[PDB]
Design a protein around this nucleic acid. Sequence first.
RNA 1: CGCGGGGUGGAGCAGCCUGGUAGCUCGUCGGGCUCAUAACCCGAAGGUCGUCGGUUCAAAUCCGGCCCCCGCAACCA
RNA 2: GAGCCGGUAGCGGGCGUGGAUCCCUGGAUGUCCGAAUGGGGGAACCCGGCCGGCGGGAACGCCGGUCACCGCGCUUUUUGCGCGGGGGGAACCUGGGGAACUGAAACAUCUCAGUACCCAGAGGAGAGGAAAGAGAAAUCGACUCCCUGAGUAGCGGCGAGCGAAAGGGGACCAGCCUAAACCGUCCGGCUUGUCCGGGCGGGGUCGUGGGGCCCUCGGACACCGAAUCCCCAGCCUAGCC
RNA 3: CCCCGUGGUUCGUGGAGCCAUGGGGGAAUCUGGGCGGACCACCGCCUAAGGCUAAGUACUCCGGGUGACCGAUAGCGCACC
RNA 4: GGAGGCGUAGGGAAACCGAGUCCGAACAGGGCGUCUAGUCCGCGGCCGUGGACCCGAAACCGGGCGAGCUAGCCCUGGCCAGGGUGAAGCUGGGGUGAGACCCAGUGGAGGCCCGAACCGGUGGGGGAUGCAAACCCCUCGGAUGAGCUGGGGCUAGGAG
RNA 5: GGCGGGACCUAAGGUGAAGCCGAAAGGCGUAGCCGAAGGGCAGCCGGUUAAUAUUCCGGCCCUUCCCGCAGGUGCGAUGG
RNA 6: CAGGCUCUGGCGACUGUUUACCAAAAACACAGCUCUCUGCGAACUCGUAAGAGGAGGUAUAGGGAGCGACGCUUGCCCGG
RNA 7: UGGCUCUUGGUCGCGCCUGCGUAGGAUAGGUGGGAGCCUGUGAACCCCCGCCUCCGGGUGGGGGGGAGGCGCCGGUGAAAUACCACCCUGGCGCGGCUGGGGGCCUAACCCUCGGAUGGGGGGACAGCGCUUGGCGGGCAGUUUGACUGGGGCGGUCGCC
RNA 8: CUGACUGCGAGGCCUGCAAGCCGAGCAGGGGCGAAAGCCGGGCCUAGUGAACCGGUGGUCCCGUGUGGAAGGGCCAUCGA
Lengths: 88, 145
Amino acid sequence: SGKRPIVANSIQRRGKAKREGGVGKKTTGISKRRQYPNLQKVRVRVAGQEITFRVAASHIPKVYELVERAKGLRLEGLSPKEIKKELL
Amino acid sequence: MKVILLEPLENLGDVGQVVDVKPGYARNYLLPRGLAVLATESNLKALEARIRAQAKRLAERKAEAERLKEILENLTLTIPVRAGETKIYGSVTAKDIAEALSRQHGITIDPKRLALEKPIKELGEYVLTYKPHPEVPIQLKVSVV
RNA sequence: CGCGGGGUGGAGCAGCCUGGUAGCUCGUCGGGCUCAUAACCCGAAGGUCGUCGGUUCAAAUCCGGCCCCCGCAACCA
RNA sequence: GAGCCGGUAGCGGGCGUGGAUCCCUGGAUGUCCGAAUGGGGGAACCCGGCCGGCGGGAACGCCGGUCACCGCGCUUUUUGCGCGGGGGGAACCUGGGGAACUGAAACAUCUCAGUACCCAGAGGAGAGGAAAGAGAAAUCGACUCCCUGAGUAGCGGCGAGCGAAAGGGGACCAGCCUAAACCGUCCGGCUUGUCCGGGCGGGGUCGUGGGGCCCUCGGACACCGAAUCCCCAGCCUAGCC
RNA sequence: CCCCGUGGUUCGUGGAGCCAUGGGGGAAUCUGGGCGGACCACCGCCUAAGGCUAAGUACUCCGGGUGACCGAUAGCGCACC
RNA sequence: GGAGGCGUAGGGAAACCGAGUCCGAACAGGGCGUCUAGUCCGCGGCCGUGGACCCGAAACCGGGCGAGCUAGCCCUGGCCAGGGUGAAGCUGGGGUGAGACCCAGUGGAGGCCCGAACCGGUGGGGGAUGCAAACCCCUCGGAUGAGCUGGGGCUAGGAG
RNA sequence: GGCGGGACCUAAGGUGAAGCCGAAAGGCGUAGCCGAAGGGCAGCCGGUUAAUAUUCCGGCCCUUCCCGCAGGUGCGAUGG
RNA sequence: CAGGCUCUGGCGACUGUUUACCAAAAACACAGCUCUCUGCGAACUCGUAAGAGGAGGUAUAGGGAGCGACGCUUGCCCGG
RNA sequence: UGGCUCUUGGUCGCGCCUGCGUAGGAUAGGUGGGAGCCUGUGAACCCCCGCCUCCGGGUGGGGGGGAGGCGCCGGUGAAAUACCACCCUGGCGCGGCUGGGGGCCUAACCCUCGGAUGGGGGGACAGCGCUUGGCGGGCAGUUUGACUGGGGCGGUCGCC
RNA sequence: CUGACUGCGAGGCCUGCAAGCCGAGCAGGGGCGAAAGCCGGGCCUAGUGAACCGGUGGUCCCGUGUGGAAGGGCCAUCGA
Ligand SMILES: [Mg+2]
Ligand SMILES: [Mg+2]
Ligand SMILES: [Mg+2]
Ligand SMILES: [Mg+2]
Ligand SMILES: [Mg+2]
Ligand SMILES: [Mg+2]
Ligand SMILES: [Mg+2]
Ligand SMILES: [Mg+2]
Ligand SMILES: [Mg+2]
Ligand SMILES: [Mg+2]
Ligand SMILES: [Mg+2]
Ligand SMILES: [Mg+2]
Ligand SMILES: [Mg+2]
Ligand SMILES: [Mg+2]
Ligand SMILES: [Mg+2]
Ligand SMILES: [Mg+2]
Ligand SMILES: [Mg+2]
Ligand SMILES: [Mg+2]
Ligand SMILES: [Mg+2]
Ligand SMILES: [Mg+2]
Ligand SMILES: [Mg+2]
Ligand SMILES: [Mg+2]
Ligand SMILES: [Mg+2]
Ligand SMILES: [Mg+2]
Ligand SMILES: [Mg+2]
Ligand SMILES: [Mg+2]
Ligand SMILES: [Mg+2]
Ligand SMILES: [Mg+2]
Ligand SMILES: [Mg+2]
Ligand SMILES: [Mg+2]
Ligand SMILES: [Mg+2]
Ligand SMILES: [Mg+2]
Ligand SMILES: [Mg+2]
Ligand SMILES: [Mg+2]
Ligand SMILES: [Mg+2]
Ligand SMILES: [Mg+2]
Ligand SMILES: [Mg+2]
Ligand SMILES: [Mg+2]
Ligand SMILES: [Mg+2]
Ligand SMILES: [Mg+2]
Ligand SMILES: [Mg+2]
Ligand SMILES: [Mg+2]
Ligand SMILES: [Mg+2]
Ligand SMILES: [Mg+2]
Ligand SMILES: [Mg+2]
Ligand SMILES: [Mg+2]
Ligand SMILES: [Mg+2]
Ligand SMILES: [Mg+2]
Ligand SMILES: [Mg+2]
Ligand SMILES: [Mg+2]
Ligand SMILES: [Mg+2]
Ligand SMILES: [Mg+2]
Ligand SMILES: [Mg+2]
Ligand SMILES: [Mg+2]
Ligand SMILES: [Mg+2]
Ligand SMILES: [Mg+2]
Ligand SMILES: [Mg+2]
Ligand SMILES: [Mg+2]
Ligand SMILES: [Mg+2]
Ligand SMILES: [Mg+2]
Ligand SMILES: [Mg+2]
Ligand SMILES: [Mg+2]
Ligand SMILES: [Mg+2]
Ligand SMILES: [Mg+2]
Ligand SMILES: [Mg+2]
Ligand SMILES: [Mg+2]
Ligand SMILES: [Mg+2]
Ligand SMILES: [Mg+2]
Ligand SMILES: [Mg+2]
Ligand SMILES: [Mg+2]
Ligand SMILES: [Mg+2]
Ligand SMILES: [Mg+2]
Ligand SMILES: [Mg+2]
Ligand SMILES: [Mg+2]
Ligand SMILES: [Mg+2]
Ligand SMILES: [Mg+2]
Ligand SMILES: [Mg+2]
Ligand SMILES: [Mg+2]
Ligand SMILES: [Mg+2]
Ligand SMILES: [Mg+2]
Ligand SMILES: [Mg+2]
Ligand SMILES: [Mg+2]
Ligand SMILES: [Mg+2]
Ligand SMILES: [Mg+2]
Ligand SMILES: [Mg+2]
Ligand SMILES: [Mg+2]
Ligand SMILES: [Mg+2]
Ligand SMILES: [Mg+2]
Ligand SMILES: [Mg+2]
Ligand SMILES: [Mg+2]
Ligand SMILES: [Mg+2]
Ligand SMILES: [Mg+2]
Ligand SMILES: [Mg+2]
Ligand SMILES: [Mg+2]
Ligand SMILES: [Mg+2]
Ligand SMILES: [Mg+2]
Ligand SMILES: [Mg+2]
Ligand SMILES: [Mg+2]
Ligand SMILES: [Mg+2]
Ligand SMILES: [Mg+2]
Ligand SMILES: [Mg+2]
Ligand SMILES: [Mg+2]
Ligand SMILES: [Mg+2]
Ligand SMILES: [Mg+2]
Ligand SMILES: [Mg+2]
Ligand SMILES: [Mg+2]
Ligand SMILES: [Mg+2]
Ligand SMILES: [Mg+2]
Ligand SMILES: [Mg+2]
Ligand SMILES: [Mg+2]
Ligand SMILES: [Mg+2]
Ligand SMILES: [Mg+2]
Ligand SMILES: [Mg+2]
Ligand SMILES: [Mg+2]
Ligand SMILES: [Mg+2]
Ligand SMILES: [Mg+2]
Ligand SMILES: [Mg+2]
Ligand SMILES: [Mg+2]
Ligand SMILES: [Mg+2]
Ligand SMILES: [Mg+2]
Ligand SMILES: [Mg+2]
Ligand SMILES: [Mg+2]
Ligand SMILES: [Mg+2]
Ligand SMILES: [Mg+2]
Ligand SMILES: [Mg+2]
Ligand SMILES: [Mg+2]
Ligand SMILES: [Mg+2]
Ligand SMILES: [Mg+2]
Ligand SMILES: [Mg+2]
Ligand SMILES: [Mg+2]
Ligand SMILES: [Mg+2]
Ligand SMILES: [Mg+2]
Ligand SMILES: [Mg+2]
Ligand SMILES: [Mg+2]
Ligand SMILES: [Mg+2]
Ligand SMILES: [Mg+2]
Ligand SMILES: [Mg+2]
Ligand SMILES: [Mg+2]
Ligand SMILES: [Mg+2]
Ligand SMILES: [Mg+2]
Ligand SMILES: [Mg+2]
Ligand SMILES: [Mg+2]
Ligand SMILES: [Mg+2]
Ligand SMILES: [Mg+2]
Ligand SMILES: [Mg+2]
Ligand SMILES: [Mg+2]
Ligand SMILES: [Mg+2]
Ligand SMILES: [Mg+2]
Ligand SMILES: [Mg+2]
Ligand SMILES: [Mg+2]
Ligand SMILES: [Mg+2]
Ligand SMILES: [Mg+2]
Ligand SMILES: [Mg+2]
Ligand SMILES: [Mg+2]
Ligand SMILES: [Mg+2]
Ligand SMILES: [Mg+2]
Ligand SMILES: [Mg+2]
Ligand SMILES: [Mg+2]
Ligand SMILES: [Mg+2]
Ligand SMILES: [Mg+2]
Ligand SMILES: [Mg+2]
Ligand SMILES: [Mg+2]
Ligand SMILES: [Mg+2]
Ligand SMILES: [Mg+2]
Ligand SMILES: [Mg+2]
Ligand SMILES: [Mg+2]
Ligand SMILES: [Mg+2]
Ligand SMILES: [Mg+2]
Ligand SMILES: [Mg+2]
Ligand SMILES: [Mg+2]
Ligand SMILES: [Mg+2]
Ligand SMILES: [Mg+2]
Ligand SMILES: [Mg+2]
Ligand SMILES: [Mg+2]
Ligand SMILES: [Mg+2]
Ligand SMILES: [Mg+2]
Ligand SMILES: [Mg+2]
Ligand SMILES: [Mg+2]
Ligand SMILES: [Mg+2]
Ligand SMILES: [Mg+2]
Ligand SMILES: [Mg+2]
Ligand SMILES: [Mg+2]
Ligand SMILES: [Mg+2]
Ligand SMILES: [Mg+2]
Ligand SMILES: [Mg+2]
Ligand SMILES: [Mg+2]
Ligand SMILES: [Mg+2]
Ligand SMILES: [Mg+2]
Ligand SMILES: [Mg+2]
Ligand SMILES: [Mg+2]
Ligand SMILES: [Mg+2]
Ligand SMILES: [Mg+2]
Ligand SMILES: [Mg+2]
Ligand SMILES: [Mg+2]
Ligand SMILES: [Mg+2]
Ligand SMILES: [Mg+2]
Ligand SMILES: [Mg+2]
Ligand SMILES: [Mg+2]
Ligand SMILES: [Mg+2]
Ligand SMILES: [Mg+2]
Ligand SMILES: [Mg+2]
Ligand SMILES: [Mg+2]
Ligand SMILES: [Mg+2]
Ligand SMILES: [Mg+2]
Ligand SMILES: [Mg+2]
Ligand SMILES: [Mg+2]
Ligand SMILES: [Mg+2]
Ligand SMILES: [Mg+2]
Ligand SMILES: [Mg+2]
Ligand SMILES: [Mg+2]
Ligand SMILES: [Mg+2]
Ligand SMILES: [Mg+2]
Ligand SMILES: [Mg+2]
Ligand SMILES: [Mg+2]
Ligand SMILES: [Mg+2]
Ligand SMILES: [Mg+2]
Ligand SMILES: [Mg+2]
Ligand SMILES: [Mg+2]
Ligand SMILES: [Mg+2]
Ligand SMILES: [Mg+2]
Ligand SMILES: [Mg+2]
Ligand SMILES: [Mg+2]
Ligand SMILES: [Mg+2]
Ligand SMILES: [Mg+2]
Ligand SMILES: [Mg+2]
Ligand SMILES: [Mg+2]
Ligand SMILES: [Mg+2]
Ligand SMILES: [Mg+2]
Ligand SMILES: [Mg+2]
Ligand SMILES: [Mg+2]
Ligand SMILES: [Mg+2]
Ligand SMILES: [Mg+2]
Ligand SMILES: [Mg+2]
Ligand SMILES: [Mg+2]
Ligand SMILES: [Mg+2]
Ligand SMILES: [Mg+2]
Ligand SMILES: [Mg+2]
Ligand SMILES: [Mg+2]
Ligand SMILES: [Mg+2]
Ligand SMILES: [Mg+2]
Ligand SMILES: [Mg+2]
Ligand SMILES: [Mg+2]
Ligand SMILES: [Mg+2]
Ligand SMILES: [Mg+2]
Ligand SMILES: [Mg+2]
Ligand SMILES: [Mg+2]
Ligand SMILES: [Mg+2]
Ligand SMILES: [Mg+2]
Ligand SMILES: [Mg+2]
Ligand SMILES: [Mg+2]
Ligand SMILES: [Mg+2]
Ligand SMILES: [Mg+2]
Ligand SMILES: [Mg+2]
Ligand SMILES: [Mg+2]
Ligand SMILES: [Mg+2]
Ligand SMILES: [Mg+2]
Ligand SMILES: [Mg+2]
Ligand SMILES: [Mg+2]
Ligand SMILES: [Mg+2]
Ligand SMILES: [Mg+2]
Ligand SMILES: [Mg+2]
Ligand SMILES: [Mg+2]
Ligand SMILES: [Mg+2]
Ligand SMILES: [Mg+2]
Ligand SMILES: [Mg+2]
Ligand SMILES: [Mg+2]
Ligand SMILES: [Mg+2]
Ligand SMILES: [Mg+2]
Ligand SMILES: [Mg+2]
Ligand SMILES: [Mg+2]
Ligand SMILES: [Mg+2]
Ligand SMILES: [Mg+2]
Ligand SMILES: [Mg+2]
Ligand SMILES: [Mg+2]
Ligand SMILES: [Mg+2]
Ligand SMILES: [Mg+2]
Ligand SMILES: [Mg+2]
Ligand SMILES: [Mg+2]
Ligand SMILES: [Mg+2]
Ligand SMILES: [Mg+2]
Ligand SMILES: [Mg+2]
Ligand SMILES: [Mg+2]
Ligand SMILES: [Mg+2]
Ligand SMILES: [Mg+2]
Ligand SMILES: [Mg+2]
């Protein structure tokens, strides 16, 4: 999946194997294949409660940057999932 | 990573600093324990504030130091309070040293920022050392009688 | 094709570092010794050290090219 | 404007110039099933909560109302209340996935073809759209569609095949709003600050570069103007001469 | 932005740029930054990483009009319950 | 409606030149080209692209539909006339130092025996436009088991 | 009302709050809910109709529920 | 209604299983032997995944393979 | 994707040291300069210490000691033996860049414990993402010629 | 001594096409020979391979806004 601040699906783009010179020629073999987004979990606190993020490796920082913006935010209310959501 | 730490560590350094560490050390330790903080744009500036605020602050106090430093130098506090022929009937403290000053002129001064251990019980004239700033000492002339 | 490392006694290899050095095993002949092959002991012959050119006082040695076998992957319309 | 109680005659019995049947518009009523939505389930059935009613009526039954889930917003968490989603549609449209036969006179690159089909979503269309454009003219000026450019330029086991764009001719014609600097205010947090952040309001939108703040111009009634709003013409949903 | 893997384009790795982007590294705010088919210089063009926008276009469930269209083995599978 | 197309000039890979031009040192030779044709519409014959005269595969691929037949398992129930044989164990007696062991009685074991239901399908005949798209008669196999059977439910197409 | 099923229970399975997974469609899943030819539950004998009958009738017998009374006791649950 | 018996070979130990509809067997299966993988979030299988089976099992267990009651036995070769 | 620590490599700069056939008196990597060079910018002879070895000498660090010490040519080898310079072969001390190996830790990530903000095991490993090369009928798509007194097998396939 | 030439090539043989073969003479520039003249390999008929893709040398040419460069073309030759 893709899920979080990430915003990245999983693109199906082929991988074609070839045999060759480049200084004599270059020929082929080709098939569809699915490229996945490097993707990790990120646990963080945010007031009370924990809260995980199924984010891509790229935007791991964005998530911390989000908790920083959350300090300026008024939250609580037994909001486990609810925080994440209201957490933009 | 760039991070601004809020705690001295033999590791990285004294508080308020800003040092590069590997993101891990930040993400999974320093940052959440709170020993350090993501040095975002906001924080770097929130640190300007934290500086400028006390920075100009102290200088503006030292201001009111060269203010007293000039008055307190060209002046002697004549302190009339009964006394034997050498010793004093009772005693003069900084508190008194202070009120006499705040009356005999109107200049207010913190009694504590005034070097004097045991109260004066001798009769005579002295010069006690006042200190609102650790780089602005003031020799205060006086005269119990 | 470019990459790598060698052509040393009748057989190879050590010597090629970091120049001042041909020795090893078996083999050939002779001698010693055994019933005897043989083991064993003494001694000797059999190498432009692939080749030519160059450094150096001095090379198998360092360097160029060449002649050849081995190996490396990689290309073949 | 004379008949009428469908197709549908007959048994039986009615209605119409006190203007019926019939046609157009609006409203009413609308069992159960179906997105199906109180809960269940083998659609068209079965069982129940709360409130009010019906019967002698507390047991039973029936009637009226109401009670799924999900998103967004007020609700202080709360529990609420409010607007929205759900499902369907011939073809058309966009997006996420996506073949093989067959062709190459075999076949693997290649072709068929981003077609067939599956999925989600849009709507009377959909997509695209005001230049980080094109490309050689010190030129053009959003997007879309048609003609042409052109079977060109190219791509290609240089095979089989595939196959542009600019430019010109037409249709249509339209441009706009934000983000940020800076200013104001509401709330939170905290190492109370000349701060950090979140929300709301002002401000601002460009490539002759534009915008912000500061100073000078006078800063203006004027000037432009909706793709939102109102009314009207016209038009369609019965007829008439 | 450069690199690795790909997709789009006429472009099948080709001297391969442009648009897009799964992985890695990772800026700047106009003396900025993209592009004009590798690259470099010169000279031009253009301002990315927010959004909306009518008409001209496509379709025929539906109603109407018309035919060198059919006439019941034809014409829609069905003129007909 | 002149955008656009074809035609008016060729030769050369091109740069280029032009009634020429290319090869070449060549005013040798030689290739190709000069001494003009064309286009627009109708019609016909053929060619290319599309299913391209018509009817016919065995196949392949995409999405769906099937385990109410059959196969396996899961859940819960049901069924197996009658007869036979007589294991261990136990009781008792014998036996020995104690015992193994012996005998009798008792007992009721078993993918045990005979054989109906029920589950098969061995050989023969019959049937062969059938009673029947697998039947019929004789015969034969299993029959407390790895048994048979009702109801509920699960697994499927390169999959079960 | 008593037979069978339902206003009872749970089985395999199914479904499916929570939770997890997946390009979409979807896949898995605790509780719970559904799911029976299993558990649970009150009717027998006889008569009668052209045609039904533990269903109508006759005799005899029983269950749950509501209300009231009399008597009795800490009563009380999806929890043990 | 209701066994023809005997002797002697082959195959397969045995009861079972099978080509629904031309093959019931000497074919499969079987108890049993051997090799081998697997230390538990097991190995292996299904699934893109989550997950599930394995097993709520733990090497006297589980997967894979061959041989196939029982008796006697199972030689030499590690170049490919 | 992290904290600590030991250990080791490449490579560059700096610093410093090693590389001993006769010969010349000599155990002088190279080439070139220049007769002069050290010592109070405290020397020779001698005690202590590190490192090398060709077993002699060599070089660096602590003291006694005191104004004395080396070179040159002749000699001599292939070259000259003070001193200064660029550099080589090999190595040591510093920092820069950069990698390989061991150990420990816990907080990522993973497992687990009658909820746990927690505790226990694992641990920067494993899982997963991108990329590398490999093994790979488990699976997929295809290919596997024509002549031919039928096909196959055999023979043949172009040129003189 | 190096005509085992360079630039051509009238005209034919042969032939479905593609290909194969013989060739006078012209220019350049040269070898042998006194000269006439002969020499564009070998007495002759076998000793071979279209196209495409690519390599090395060269060179009037092309070079994506311009100048270069990348690459390509042309000539020569190479890998069946
Ligand atoms: Mg996820
Ligand atoms: Mg991404
Ligand atoms: Mg998605
Ligand atoms: Mg790949
Ligand atoms: Mg190349
Ligand atoms: Mg190719
Ligand atoms: Mg293909
Ligand atoms: Mg394919
Ligand atoms: Mg993490
Ligand atoms: Mg969460
Ligand atoms: Mg990254
Ligand atoms: Mg914030
Ligand atoms: Mg809440
Ligand atoms: Mg809550
Ligand atoms: Mg939400
Ligand atoms: Mg809110
Ligand atoms: Mg990191
Ligand atoms: Mg006094
Ligand atoms: Mg007195
Ligand atoms: Mg006062
Ligand atoms: Mg004051
Ligand atoms: Mg004061
Ligand atoms: Mg100070
Ligand atoms: Mg090598
Ligand atoms: Mg040898
Ligand atoms: Mg040897
Ligand atoms: Mg040796
Ligand atoms: Mg010997
Ligand atoms: Mg010899
Ligand atoms: Mg030799
Ligand atoms: Mg010799
Ligand atoms: Mg050989
Ligand atoms: Mg060999
Ligand atoms: Mg080798
Ligand atoms: Mg009428
Ligand atoms: Mg009527
Ligand atoms: Mg009627
Ligand atoms: Mg009627
Ligand atoms: Mg009538
Ligand atoms: Mg009538
Ligand atoms: Mg009548
Ligand atoms: Mg009428
Ligand atoms: Mg009528
Ligand atoms: Mg109506
Ligand atoms: Mg009503
Ligand atoms: Mg309903
Ligand atoms: Mg409702
Ligand atoms: Mg429902
Ligand atoms: Mg009520
Ligand atoms: Mg009532
Ligand atoms: Mg209603
Ligand atoms: Mg109700
Ligand atoms: Mg929900
Ligand atoms: Mg909701
Ligand atoms: Mg709202
Ligand atoms: Mg809400
Ligand atoms: Mg409200
Ligand atoms: Mg509010
Ligand atoms: Mg709420
Ligand atoms: Mg309230
Ligand atoms: Mg609330
Ligand atoms: Mg509500
Ligand atoms: Mg509610
Ligand atoms: Mg509302
Ligand atoms: Mg809607
Ligand atoms: Mg819709
Ligand atoms: Mg698409
Ligand atoms: Mg897609
Ligand atoms: Mg095929
Ligand atoms: Mg074929
Ligand atoms: Mg295609
Ligand atoms: Mg599509
Ligand atoms: Mg959706
Ligand atoms: Mg829809
Ligand atoms: Mg539109
Ligand atoms: Mg749009
Ligand atoms: Mg704009
Ligand atoms: Mg195509
Ligand atoms: Mg086409
Ligand atoms: Mg076009
Ligand atoms: Mg145009
Ligand atoms: Mg136009
Ligand atoms: Mg028009
Ligand atoms: Mg316009
Ligand atoms: Mg604010
Ligand atoms: Mg907000
Ligand atoms: Mg604002
Ligand atoms: Mg605003
Ligand atoms: Mg505005
Ligand atoms: Mg303005
Ligand atoms: Mg703009
Ligand atoms: Mg400006
Ligand atoms: Mg202003
Ligand atoms: Mg004014
Ligand atoms: Mg103004
Ligand atoms: Mg507007
Ligand atoms: Mg009208
Ligand atoms: Mg009307
Ligand atoms: Mg009238
Ligand atoms: Mg770029
Ligand atoms: Mg990569
Ligand atoms: Mg790669
Ligand atoms: Mg790329
Ligand atoms: Mg694609
Ligand atoms: Mg492509
Ligand atoms: Mg194309
Ligand atoms: Mg392509
Ligand atoms: Mg490309
Ligand atoms: Mg790009
Ligand atoms: Mg990317
Ligand atoms: Mg760009
Ligand atoms: Mg451009
Ligand atoms: Mg360019
Ligand atoms: Mg531009
Ligand atoms: Mg722009
Ligand atoms: Mg921008
Ligand atoms: Mg913009
Ligand atoms: Mg825009
Ligand atoms: Mg945009
Ligand atoms: Mg639009
Ligand atoms: Mg139209
Ligand atoms: Mg019509
Ligand atoms: Mg009509
Ligand atoms: Mg008509
Ligand atoms: Mg007609
Ligand atoms: Mg008919
Ligand atoms: Mg018909
Ligand atoms: Mg007729
Ligand atoms: Mg007919
Ligand atoms: Mg129709
Ligand atoms: Mg019809
Ligand atoms: Mg009908
Ligand atoms: Mg009909
Ligand atoms: Mg031409
Ligand atoms: Mg001529
Ligand atoms: Mg001719
Ligand atoms: Mg001519
Ligand atoms: Mg001619
Ligand atoms: Mg002509
Ligand atoms: Mg014509
Ligand atoms: Mg024609
Ligand atoms: Mg033709
Ligand atoms: Mg054609
Ligand atoms: Mg056909
Ligand atoms: Mg035809
Ligand atoms: Mg045709
Ligand atoms: Mg079945
Ligand atoms: Mg059956
Ligand atoms: Mg029995
Ligand atoms: Mg007995
Ligand atoms: Mg006894
Ligand atoms: Mg006994
Ligand atoms: Mg007895
Ligand atoms: Mg016994
Ligand atoms: Mg006994
Ligand atoms: Mg007995
Ligand atoms: Mg017995
Ligand atoms: Mg008995
Ligand atoms: Mg039996
Ligand atoms: Mg038997
Ligand atoms: Mg029976
Ligand atoms: Mg039977
Ligand atoms: Mg039978
Ligand atoms: Mg039979
Ligand atoms: Mg049979
Ligand atoms: Mg038979
Ligand atoms: Mg028969
Ligand atoms: Mg018959
Ligand atoms: Mg018959
Ligand atoms: Mg029988
Ligand atoms: Mg039997
Ligand atoms: Mg059964
Ligand atoms: Mg059963
Ligand atoms: Mg049933
Ligand atoms: Mg199939
Ligand atoms: Mg299929
Ligand atoms: Mg299979
Ligand atoms: Mg299978
Ligand atoms: Mg009963
Ligand atoms: Mg009942
Ligand atoms: Mg129930
Ligand atoms: Mg039930
Ligand atoms: Mg239940
Ligand atoms: Mg269950
Ligand atoms: Mg789902
Ligand atoms: Mg979903
Ligand atoms: Mg499910
Ligand atoms: Mg159900
Ligand atoms: Mg139930
Ligand atoms: Mg029951
Ligand atoms: Mg029952
Ligand atoms: Mg009873
Ligand atoms: Mg009764
Ligand atoms: Mg009874
Ligand atoms: Mg009856
Ligand atoms: Mg009764
Ligand atoms: Mg009690
Ligand atoms: Mg109590
Ligand atoms: Mg109780
Ligand atoms: Mg009998
Ligand atoms: Mg018998
Ligand atoms: Mg007999
Ligand atoms: Mg027998
Ligand atoms: Mg058998
Ligand atoms: Mg046997
Ligand atoms: Mg049996
Ligand atoms: Mg079976
Ligand atoms: Mg059978
Ligand atoms: Mg059977
Ligand atoms: Mg059959
Ligand atoms: Mg069959
Ligand atoms: Mg049998
Ligand atoms: Mg079988
Ligand atoms: Mg076994
Ligand atoms: Mg055995
Ligand atoms: Mg093991
Ligand atoms: Mg598998
Ligand atoms: Mg798998
Ligand atoms: Mg498990
Ligand atoms: Mg289990
Ligand atoms: Mg085993
Ligand atoms: Mg034996
Ligand atoms: Mg054996
Ligand atoms: Mg033997
Ligand atoms: Mg072997
Ligand atoms: Mg071995
Ligand atoms: Mg071996
Ligand atoms: Mg790693
Ligand atoms: Mg040396
Ligand atoms: Mg020597
Ligand atoms: Mg001498
Ligand atoms: Mg010098
Ligand atoms: Mg000199
Ligand atoms: Mg001199
Ligand atoms: Mg010196
Ligand atoms: Mg000196
Ligand atoms: Mg020493
Ligand atoms: Mg030395
Ligand atoms: Mg000298
Ligand atoms: Mg010297
Ligand atoms: Mg350091
Ligand atoms: Mg280092
Ligand atoms: Mg370093
Ligand atoms: Mg380490
Ligand atoms: Mg450890
Ligand atoms: Mg520990
Ligand atoms: Mg630990
Ligand atoms: Mg701890
Ligand atoms: Mg992690
Ligand atoms: Mg926890
Ligand atoms: Mg934790
Ligand atoms: Mg823990
Ligand atoms: Mg732990
Ligand atoms: Mg540990
Ligand atoms: Mg480890
Ligand atoms: Mg790792
Ligand atoms: Mg292998
Ligand atoms: Mg294999
Ligand atoms: Mg392979
Ligand atoms: Mg293979
Ligand atoms: Mg295959
Ligand atoms: Mg194919
Ligand atoms: Mg082939
Ligand atoms: Mg043939
Ligand atoms: Mg033949
Ligand atoms: Mg014949
Ligand atoms: Mg053959
Ligand atoms: Mg020939
Ligand atoms: Mg000719
Ligand atoms: Mg010819
Ligand atoms: Mg020839
Ligand atoms: Mg010929
Ligand atoms: Mg000859
Ligand atoms: Mg001939
Ligand atoms: Mg080809
Ligand atoms: Mg070429
Ligand atoms: Mg050139
Ligand atoms: Mg030329
Ligand atoms: Mg040029
Ligand atoms: Mg040029
Ligand atoms: Mg261009
Ligand atoms: Mg130009
Ligand atoms: Mg250029
Ligand atoms: Mg070139
Ligand atoms: Mg070239």
